Amino acid sequence: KDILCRLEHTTLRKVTANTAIYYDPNPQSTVVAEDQEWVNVYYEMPDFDVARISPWLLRVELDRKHMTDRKLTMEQIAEKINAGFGDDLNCIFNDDNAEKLVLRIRIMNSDENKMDDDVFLRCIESNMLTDMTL
Amino acid sequence: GPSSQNVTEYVVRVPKNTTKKYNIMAFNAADKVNFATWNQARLERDLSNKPEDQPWLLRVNGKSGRKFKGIKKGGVTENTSYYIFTQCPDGAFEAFPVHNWYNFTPLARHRTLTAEEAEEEWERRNKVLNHFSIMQQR
Amino acid sequence: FIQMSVQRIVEDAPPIDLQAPPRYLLKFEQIYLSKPTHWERDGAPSPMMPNEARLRNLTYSAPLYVDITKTVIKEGEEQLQTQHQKT
Amino acid sequence: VGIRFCQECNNMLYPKEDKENRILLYACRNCDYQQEADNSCIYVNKITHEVDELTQIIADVSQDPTLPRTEDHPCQKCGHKEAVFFQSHSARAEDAMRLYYVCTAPHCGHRWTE
Amino acid sequence: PILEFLEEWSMENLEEISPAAIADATKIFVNGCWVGIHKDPEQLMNTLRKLRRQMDIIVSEVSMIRDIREREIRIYTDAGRICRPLLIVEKQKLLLKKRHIDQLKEREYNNYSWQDLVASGVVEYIDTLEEETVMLAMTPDDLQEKEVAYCSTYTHCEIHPSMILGVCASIIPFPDHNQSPRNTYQSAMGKQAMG
Amino acid sequence: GAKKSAIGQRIVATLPYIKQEVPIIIVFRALGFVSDRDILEHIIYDFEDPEMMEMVKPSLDEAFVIQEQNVALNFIGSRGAKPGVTKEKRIKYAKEVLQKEMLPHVGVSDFCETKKAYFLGYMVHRLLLAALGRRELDDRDHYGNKR
Amino acid sequence: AERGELDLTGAKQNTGVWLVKVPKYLSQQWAKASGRGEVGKLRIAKTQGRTEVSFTLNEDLANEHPFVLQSVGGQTLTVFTESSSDKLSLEGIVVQRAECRPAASENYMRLKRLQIEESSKPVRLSQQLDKVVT
Ligand SMILES: [Zn+2]
Ligand SMILES: [Zn+2]
DSSP states (O other), rough: HHHHHHHSSOOOTTTEEEEEEESSSSTOOSSSSHHHHHHHHHHOOSSSSOOOOOSSSEEEOOOOHHHHHTTTOHOOOOOHHHHHHHHEEEEEEEETTTEEEEEEEOOOHHHOOOOSSSHHHHHHHHHHIISSBB | OOGGGGEEEEEOOSOOOEEEEEEEEEEEEEGGOOOOOOOOOEEEOSSSSSTTSSOOEEEEEETTTTTEEEOOOOOOTTOOOOEEEEEEEEEEEEEEHHHHHHEEEEEEESSOOOOHHHHHSSSSSOOOOOHHHHHHHH | TTTHHHHHHHHHOOEEEOOOOOOEEEEEEEEEEOOOOOOOSSSSSEEHHHHHHHTTOOOOOOOOOEEEEEEEEOOOEHHHHHEEOOO | OOOOOTTTTOOOOOEETTTTTTTEEEEETOOEEEEOOOOOEEEEEEESSOHHHHSSSSSSGGGGSSSOOOEEEEEEETOSSEEEEEOOOOOTTSSSOEEEEOOOOOOOEEEOOO | OOOHHHHHHHHHHHHTTTGGGTSSSSSEEEEEEEEEEEOHHHHHHHHHHHHHTSSSOOOOOOOOETTTTTTEEEEOOOOOOOEEEEEEEEEEEEOHHHHHHHHTOOOOOTTTOOHHHHHHHHHEEHHHHHTTTEEEEEEEEIIISSSSSSSOOOOOOSSOGGGGGTTGGGGGGSGGGSSSSHHHHHHHHHHHHOO | OHHHHOOOOEEEETTTTTSSOOEEHHHHHHTTTSHHHHHHHEEEEETHHHHHHHHHHHHHHHHHOOOOOOHHHHHHHHSSSSSSSHHHHHHHHHHHHHIISSSSSOOSSOHHHHHHHHHHHHHHHHHHHHHHHHOOOOOSGGGGGOO | SSSSBBBBBHHTOOOEEEEEEOHHHHHHHHHHHOSSSSSSEEEEEEESEEEEEEEEEHHHHOEEEOOOOOOOOEEEEEEEEEETTSSSEEEEEEEEEEEEEOSSSSSSHHHHHOOOHHHHHHHOOEEEESSSSO
């Protein structure tokens, strides 16, 4: 089965419950308390993003059953997203203990510091769901 | 009280001919029309064709107010009739047939891309970027 | 088709208007159909039996006639109307 | 997720941010009208889209003579014994064999899934 | 005649309603033309069915289809629609009774004919589209009778299941005991038989 | 594409006597329905449903340039059976096609625009249901669809 | 004050009118009377929690018409008149919508059958000729 998983193509669409885009002006009080519990931990001593951060947020919910079936790890997914987009995007994910798996995505700080800031994130959402390979 | 068992009866009157014809003016509920703001109202036939066989044009409060265009109803009430009941001091209801049915739709008042200019935007068939910026140039 | 469509098609046809001054109008009012008839070489009509058509290689067809009303306007404020029954 | 139209020319309202206030706004393209955004969510994409089929079901289906009727699943609301059951037969589910029950009692369009 | 009755009935014209009211109401289609909407489809269908069975305003060859799930009522009156006569079933009972059979038995010198059955409202023509909404019984002797509960709501019944065959397939004896390709082969062969 | 993928799938209409596909929203504009709310009212009968609303968004963006009925009519006339020497002829020809050549069974008169808009929206509404999977695709072999 | 200006006094008075659809026979009878001065009487009965509206046909005119009300929130209907003097005026705003239905259930269809027969009277159809036209 390990070989099977290593061969069968897996894109972010397969193991994604849903994707939502919020304006998220303040990173601290991002959307709701659920993210507040763990988002702060990353923001208590954040690195590589203290300079600036894009206003728009891309929240991704990942199905636990699908993730378990392919034995995928959130850290691995973040590394893959980071590897694909480099520093263009900042990926924040919660611990696997939480019943809900979340992964916040934003755009590089340097750009924040031409098409649009909300449409472009929409393109990335579609780009990551299908084109990106996990 | 009396309202719990109130009974009312009124007579119906159908005058043969009326000096003024009766029509029906309709507005979309989502339009959120407000007759209080209708300080002035002007109703004239449209000039697009260039009379009785042409759509109506409604203008409210001149250019400042919303402009609506009236269109005669295509359906014909050959097997149906429409009447309006108006309260009168005598208390006998009066029924007036509707000469025609017209539907009025609001017209937007803002810089609209010209047909010649719309051709230029057609080259950006799907490569259009920042849809908001399109009207900024206009 | 014979009872309704043929009449409907003829009725639905717009009146023919000629103007080139005098103005001529033509309208097809009613459609008439007779029994399947055969004409001998001498011109005498006779009912065409289906067996006869099979043997003599004829076509089992019924003559078709239409009422046409011809109204002419000569610009003299005078209208002359004539009907050519069963044309 | 919600859809809004400007009150001026009744055209589609699209999201937009103002740098000065850093607050989400909905602005009409051909109108220049702007509105304060209260949802704060531009859109939500449901890949699984596990939409509750009960909402999609119409209570009038109980009037269908071809649907099977079972008396072993009484209505939870009115208690009517007779009920009509059927499958979703909705595409994009990728799997559908469960039964959806609708109360046959008139004026009680209760629907449930066992 | 159908459109005029619909206007007379509590059907709202499409040009007079607001778009918001369409969601709850059911669209009414006559010969593929969306004429209007109705807020009481069940009553309208029953009224329409009653009229056709009585041959009052609706002729026998008119198809009335109610898509309950889609909230649409489609009425068809054009030509080219294939339909077959089916016995009407009400409350698991055939509207055809012994009296109709007895009247038919004396088909001649009685003026009682098939058209009387249609006028009587015991047998009606059903097209393909309306058949989808019809719960039909193969035979009354077995499917209508009380038994293991399979279908307690039957709308029509076959006059005879053997009628599904055509002219050539109808001359095959015991065609239900032969392989289907053989039945087709005979159908062609029968066309070439001398006589 | 970055833009094509994000918006999704757009709806186009193939009217008779027109060489090329016409975006659906343009046809509604040519009929006399300019505001998005008015057009969506004929296509989507329940704005409370968000899934169907998102389906028509890409189509709206496609016809965003055209915001006038006359502009929509000229655009259709541009693809007419014969080239239009002047804009007036193009608009007149476009009205001619829509008036009678488009959905003639719905109507063939000059006051049938509203009737055709509803039917055209129903066709779009039917298409959306199939795309959304809420309605099964029609079967050509079904003889209920045959004459 | 202008020819194209529309009078809005009726709207300012909050005048309320009722929109009622009636069958052909009721309208035909009223047309037959030619407006003698009366065609019937409308009766409204209001109970503790329900309202009943019906119309009674004149006995002379004949030689019950219950009224069903409809919600008006779906549209805003106003009545405007075009006087023969070319002075358009707004009569008022419709405040209630009702529909008139017949009382007869089955015997009414007999009248419709005659009405359909009357409608089909001018429906011309082809005629058969015993002899060929000469
Ligand atoms: Zn606007
Ligand atoms: Zn119940």
